[model samples]
Target: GKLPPVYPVTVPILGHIIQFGKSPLGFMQECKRQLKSGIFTINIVGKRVTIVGDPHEHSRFFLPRNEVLSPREVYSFMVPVFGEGVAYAAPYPRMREQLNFLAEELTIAKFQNFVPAIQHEVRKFMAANWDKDEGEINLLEDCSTMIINTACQCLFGEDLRKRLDARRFAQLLAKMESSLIPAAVFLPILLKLPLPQSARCHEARTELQKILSEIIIARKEEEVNKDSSTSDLLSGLLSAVYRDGTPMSLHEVCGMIVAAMFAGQHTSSITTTWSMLHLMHPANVKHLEALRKEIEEFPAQLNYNNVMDEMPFAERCARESIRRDPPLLMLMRKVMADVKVGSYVVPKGDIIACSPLLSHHDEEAFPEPRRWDPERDEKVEGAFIGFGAGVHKCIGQKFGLLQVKTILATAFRSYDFQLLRDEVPDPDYHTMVVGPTASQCRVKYIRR
Candidate 1:
């Protein structure tokens, strides 16, 4: 089949592997520059992946029916992390049902109840983790702790909240997260090897499964009435029936919860960290007082509805931050059948790739792409794909943004913070979810 223009690679089998591994965003930009087209091809470990950059082309990539382009094939690496019988391992129809449950469970009705929980968790985290008045802290780790704690309270319920130690959970997640390698997705064979990386991931998975299963088993025994009205994700999953009219199994329930946490925790925390880093810059620090002022002007209370409505500037700041540095550098899919992307044939079995990081930085889409200006809120539709697009977009987007907003509002209101240095932290992309590099995330705060 005639493929897209190949971005010539010097290395034989491991084409662009070294360059891509070092800096995927830069590599993609270079490929587009060399090809002089939005579409091109590059080989990774001998596998040819068609790269698409045009937002119009992105619509084509995301719009096609799952039969032609399957995300399952690309995300099979997630099976071990989320366990079998869930998410990528499940059939499409079943997965759709689960996605529906997730979407409904995180809708505004349920989210309103989450505000107090999120606010409480954030306050408690700051109190315990931060210095009394002033001290330096790692924003990445601290943000992870806050998000995980809030996620546990709202999604896993109070029982799991009491049992979980946020800091330890973050450490375990770091171990499991580091195990996700390039080969894990393309070559599943490596997962079978008894390497130390796989061993650590296995251990983390085992412990997580135990914790989730215990909670699920107890919820089953209690026969808790479940519905969309239920505030927690676990309860909603328990209440949701499979297409076959059977209740979701223990493994399925645990898998769903684990998948939600693994996806939500890292992205929310990292985005929060990044947003703060951008908002706290010397040039941008003025926005902090403006955002805090907006928060205080809320009429009666700072619930979800009021909070979202009241904080437009902070919302834009969040959007701007995400646009500047999306947590997931690249989103991928496997072409199940021969498909067309921007005048090129992407043959079956080849991977289709696009970088949200790259798309977010497109000069045409976002003027002065590198500039950190919240006023660039040019709601130009497909131009901004921070949370992503189409069927597989993050379901808990509103809730995640609420967490970021709440943290920003609460922290800035109570304390003033600044980076230890003037330089913005470079992202650490060694793991799947990108984060601030070591010590670059360091900041000191004093009571306002």
Candidate 2:
């Protein structure tokens, strides 16, 4: 039993081009308007994408039993870019092994071991880029660079940090993210054009793979002499293996590295940028001050639960950021068998989607959904999927949150800050994630 069909305003089959296109935010808003209470379909590159606005229904969409829903086929566009070596493409047994490996390494013990490295990177950013009088920097860019730098240091250990041009490496990351994946499911010939976007992605992939291979080679050589309990994610992953006690293969290791690099940098960067922007609003200044007070009382170093418990307001702010800008706005699912999402008869093999944006915006769960209020997210009930859901949910969520808090705490603990303007910076919409576009903002810092 479900609500009646809310048919598409315009439907176009696959391989057919529709001239009128909706911008990301506009399309999302339109989805909300059309799906006021029930489900709806949209013509996206010829696929009738099913969208659920209801929280319970959308929750079901994400965690559906494997018996009812098959893993959604990934877009072909990403295959050449991320390569079959990517975690998303690995077979189930392999994928689970890799995910478990990642989750273990990202634990509190491992995360605590890397604080010195994270703080070192953050201090470097503050010294070189931050000015006391200029009162502002493009914090969005600075935060992103810091995330990349920290990620590189923690993942590759110290040696690779010196070898890679951190800025150029991050640029390659941006390029890979921006590359357009052709939505034309059928046109083999049309998809062959040498797009500059894809070209950049290929170049980045090659360079990154080259660098990663060297790192893996060195690690293998050093295994006999070194203590395995090192402070980085890579070491922890290498420790995880099957019951046979054999270590992960080079391919799986590299895949985990690439996956962590992308996930950590991209999503954390976006949310942290947004969270700071929210802080820029003078109205939020009080809450921001409260955050500073809490952090001051916090010990010099923090464990996972300690940091989170002490800074509920700060955590709420970050949660609000996720609600506002879900890294992957909508997740794709495929029906293995007929399933019900609300009143809709979701037939087998049909593609289903749930908008985290939509569910979080449901007025019942979040009043004045457009208003950026952190309180609404406290003890967040209902569906607010910033890192997606179920078995496939981002394995790096805790680490991602740590990155945000660490950066914010490091910056806010000492710097009294303000944005030059009030309006939120525009984010570039490419691929599944949203990134900042020339996302410049002036923030001034005064010494405590």
Candidate 3:
């Protein structure tokens, strides 16, 4: 069998680091340009990462006979953050069960109940800032706060939410983004060093754990007094137990909460902001106006499940915005053993990353890739991967989209707005989750 062609690039230990350091996102873009193909490789500081642009290529790696391809090894990167918790160290069954439960707890029904709560929060957020004449609203930063507050309230329950200082928690959330970047990939000692970011991470973990601990205490007390189940995720998890009726440990709950915060908070916020940002694009703004008009005539808040089905126009706009700038761009996996990728072989223990940004931008798949067109998604095969695909796909997928739609439905319903493009905003790739550097989406709005 002939080997697939390997794109020309250096795989020397540390040599590729310079290329990655100067501009990581740009380096990937350049790789795609020079290689001019869907699959390639680059050694990031001696790490041999197979950079894939084709979604099928990824399927080949992750789903080959279910036996051929191994689950992406997350341990090496997450050991420090999650320790030996299910997220990083557990075997597939335990991990699978945990993730399955997470999805069940955050079902469409639970997410729908949270929409009114979100709408209330978003209005309070806008009212606090939009009326300030001399002020500028940083949609990027503000969106993070709104999502964090809403997520903390709905997912963790309101009792835990009040215990947390939203500002401090937000800062900690910002620091938490660093944990996703592998030291092996970036060679940043700052992560391991006795630095402020590291300190903030420690502090964040301490405070967050305290909040979770107190919530557990409070809920346990409530259970004793009322002896009835609550509606939050913690309660949902408790209602179910191991077949033997053994419950999850407090530490496990802590780990789950941390993972939930890490996963939902920032990524959701970035996509939400991007959706609002797209509304500033000239052609998109007009369509956004029409979408807004629909929201106004529809009475009160729309059902959350219906956001994906009923709001085709809003969903289309969001789909396009995310395609233009995906929040979490790459999916990583480690080869369990020698695996044949097309004609080329990925050796055992090698880390491979598939670029969804590249996949979403494929001209063959999405013609005129640079142009933002939500309508294009339905027309192509495997064109969009904003959330991702496969078992490791986003578990909180529906909730994330619901949050975005809820904000859009509320924010733009009666207000005429557009972002000022001169806000020095550019993509920030320093964190594991990618978002705007400036995050300054300047806008002018008027009441309906």
Error of 2 at 165 (Å): 4.2
Alpha-carbon lDDT, every model: 0.77, 0.66, 0.66
Report the lDDT tens digits of candidate 1 across residue range 1-448. Answer: 5668887879887888789889887888888887778788888877887877776678777777778878897887677666777777888888888888778878777877788778888888778877578898898888887888887777767666656667667776777777776566656576567777766776887776687777666666665555323336777776788678898876777667767777788889888888888877787866766677777665323577766677888888888888888888778888888988777788888889878887887767888877878778644457677776776777878888888888888777778778887778988867677877867888987787
How badly does each model clash, as a count of residue pairs?
A: 0, 6, 2
How well does candidate 2 score on lDDT at residue 414?
63
Which portions of model 2 miss their true places by more than 4 Å? Answer: 1-6, 9-25, 31-36, 180-203, 217-231, 239-247, 299-308, 378-380, 427-432, 435-437
Which RMSD does model 3 reach against the true structure? 3.3
Model 2 C-alpha lDDT per residue in residues 257-370, reported as the tens digit of each score = 666676688788878888877875687877687778768776665555555456677777888888876776666666677787776687665667777766767666667776
lDDT value for model 1 = 0.77
Give lDDT tens digits, candidate 3, residues 1-448: 3333344545555656666656765776677677655677776665577776665565664455323444435324553444355564566666677787788888767767777777777777878767753345678877888887777667656666667656767766566556454554345353455555545555566666676777778877987998645678777765555544677766666667667777788888888777777676576756776677657565565656556566777777677777877887776766676776656777765666767776776666777766766566534545566776665667777787777777788777745555677432566766667787754666556565
Which parts of model 3 have CA positions greater than 4 angstroms off? 1-12, 21-26, 65-68, 71-75, 132-135, 179-181, 185-203, 226-228, 243-245, 305-308, 378-380, 422-424
TM-score of 2: 0.86
Which structure among the candidates has the greatest lDDT?
1
Residue 48, model 1, lDDT? 82
What is the RMSD, in Å, between candidate 2 and the native fold over all Cα?
3.6
